């Protein structure tokens, strides 16, 4: 009935996409670190949602953000299509810094928002639980759990119904994660 | 002589075609090698029927074994709506990189590239394919393989030691 914490550290592989899939809507895949002792997460992969339209590129990140320091750091690279008898050319950004207010999963985010059990669902072939939550004037999210484990497999932030972005942790770990993981250096 | 890979390595991933095609996929994932071990594992949107694959692989050259845990992602109507099922993990025969893929395969130096800001050395081997090593640290930045090829690119190489966990599986 009291939501449970997030495991103290996790990492995964992440699978990100969108309900429902809309033509422009990409599937994407990346890995995420999260430490909530030292208060810092890092995450890898093609940016999702990232408007090629406005930007006119595709974008890779690297992003270490310490909730700690309130800062942010993120490693960047640009994928722009070159019409040619047509070819992806990389280009790497400028690493850009910035400040950072929190992880972008929160150990406690269950507790402190009030989430309430929805019921358990097989979610990446597994026993879920599911939490669901409102972000106030955001909307809903839905977050779930293995059963047994307490680890994530799946957040969902919006309704399914609706439009929602889900991403998949297919594979958590809750190793140690070594200093040299949140440098913030390429 | 050419150089070997570093005896360790690990770096986010980025993976594409040239030329890239309207149905070619843009994917990224994570990737890691040590072969002091022997060992290596790569996580991603597999690249290149009616689903997309999420893999991670962990390929075991002292073992000469890979193993694979399988995640399928089918498009269903209902708009559209992915459908995520998960497969039997998998095993067969089996690094993607050897360490001394350039000095075995008798590797030719072509001049430096710009490969993700800093001056590569580009190595070509026996369809063919080419290793891309920054000219510095020695670091691999991008793999070319195959008048189609795959491109691999490895923006953030870390030398760091790999914790046993990485590759349990």
Redesign the interface.
Known sequence: REPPLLPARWSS?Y?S?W????PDDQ?????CWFDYERDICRI???FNPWSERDTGY?L?M?EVGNAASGRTWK?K?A?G?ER?A???C?R?LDDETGPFAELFLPRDVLRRLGARHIGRRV???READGWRYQRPGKGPSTLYLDAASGTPLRMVTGDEASRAS?R?F??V?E??I?D??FAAK?
Request: glycine share 8%.
């Open positions: 592989a699978v996409y309900s429902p899939m809309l599937l994407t895949s990346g890995y890898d992969g093609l595709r890779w690297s490693q690279v994928y299509r040619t047509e070819q992806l990389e790497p979610v990446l072939g889900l998949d297919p594979n770990s190793a140690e070594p040299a993981v390429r």
